[PDB]
Each structure stands twice: as structure tokens, then as C-alpha cells.
Amino acid sequence: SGFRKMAFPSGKVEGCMVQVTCGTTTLNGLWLDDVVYCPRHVICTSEDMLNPNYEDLLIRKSNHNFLVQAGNVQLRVIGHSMQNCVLKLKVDTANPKTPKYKFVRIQPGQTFSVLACYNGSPSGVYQCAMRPNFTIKGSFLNGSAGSVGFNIDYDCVSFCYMHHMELPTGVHAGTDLEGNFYGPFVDRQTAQAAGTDTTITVNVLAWLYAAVINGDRWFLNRFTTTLNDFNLVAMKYNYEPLTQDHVDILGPLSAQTGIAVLDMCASLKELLQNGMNGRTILGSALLEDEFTPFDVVRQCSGVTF
């Protein structure tokens, strides 16, 4: 029993983290095989923060202007190129610690673990979700760019996120490992704002199922709802619309608990109307939306890697 915001074990990603310095600018890189991936704004000076032409900034650099350190070892860069908003630094040694890995682009609502690093060294690991507005509510300081987010599939690491920047509300934006930003953000320091965010409904429902699996039913009620009436209500609370695919995704939790998805939808409509009246659910006084249906099953069953 119990339920926690649980991250993936970080060991395999720890072994890929390096430091990348160009000039006086430093951040983290990801070393897989004989390539180090890092955000391209490492080539920026303090004067290149507003409107950098990265193609122009890059052509002025040679291999030896990139200082890559893996622990106490300097890696020799033998090649460099730009792919969207990441740099690929070819180095003369393959990372002996490279895990089985893939590069994936996730959808809003999906979760991942972040290994927060500075100077190529791990500071901590936490669990995140790609928000509907394509920001992540991370914990990142100056120097954290190049930290990555990931999922594990037994022994295969799926890298889904590279950290680039912080927006003025204190949320974060980054790219996939092909250097394509999530959302309409760009790697310059001109004015940018996250759009209005919404709640990840399918995840709130999965979390409510986790509550039932852990023995709590106080929030259910005797009603049902149509999908359309559910969405008409939930959207007045800035909840994302629930699609039929979402309903299908919740099938396994529905089947394990004996609660039909639209009946848990009715419970959610009431919880939004009432609040919790001094109660908590899995230790929270808010409806938690950064657990997917798969996160729930994984934590409540004991899936390992």
C-alpha cells in the first residue's frame, strides 16, 4: 500500500551525463555511443541571448572549441553538427556505459523522469508530465540545460526530453532528442509565455482508480454520466476533454476495480463540485494529474526494470 510520485531508477542515465563547455558557457550533454547531444545555445555568449543566428555562431567554431568532460576525463571532439535546436558532438570514444536506448517524442499528458544535472553531475531525480500546454513543471537552475527526461522499458531507456530553458512563470521548455521543441517555444530570450494550462483528465481518473485499489471509495457516488455531459462539465474546470481512446486506456483499471470509466467520471464531476471537505486522497488535497494509467499499474503491481 501507499502511493508516491515515483521516478524511474536513474543509474543507466547517470552513466551518460557529461559536461559541455564552449567559451565561458557550460551545460550538460548526453553521451551515447560516440556522440554527445547537447542544447545548441552552449555556443551563445551573454551577448547572443536575444536573437542568435545559430548557423552563424556555429560556423565560427571548430572541434576544439567544444570542451567535453566525462568525470575527470576530457573527450576529444572530432566532429560537430546542428540538428534543429541540439548539437551533436562526435567524439573519438564510444561511451562504454551506453545503455540500450531509443529517442521518442511524447504527447502532452505522458509522464517521464527527469535526472537534474549540473556540470555533468547528477543532482536529483524527479517525476514530471508533459503539460497540455507543452511546458513541464520542473525544478531547474542555471546550468541545468542538457538534463534529460526519460522512461525505462525493462532494460531500454527511452529519452524523450532535453532541457533548454525556463519561462517567466517558472515552468520549463525543451526539445526531444532530435532538437525539436515541445510547444511553440524558441531558444532565445525574447518574450515568451506559456498558454493557459489545463488538467490532464485521463490521469486524474487513473489516480482515482489508484485510490480505489488502495482501499478508498468515499468519493464515489451512485450516478453515471454520458461522455459528452462529462466533458461539458469538466471543461468548465479547465480540464482537458476525455476522448474514447482515453476511456479505452482506462479499461484495465476499470476492470480491476469493477468501476466503469463513466461511473468514475461521475465521481470526478462531484469531486470538482464539492472539493474534498477536509479529506485527502492518496495524501493529497488536490486532484493529482501527473500519473498515467500505466504509471498507476506499474506502481500498484510492482513492475521492475
Binding site: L27, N119, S144, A145, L167
Partner: peptide
């Protein structure tokens, strides 16, 4: 405020 590219100096 403005966005911040989170390298370090």
C-alpha cells in the same frame, strides 16, 4: 520577466 536559457557562466 523574460525567458532564461539555462546554461551557466
Amino acid at each position: 520577466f523574460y525567458p532564461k536559457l539555462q546554461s551557466s557562466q
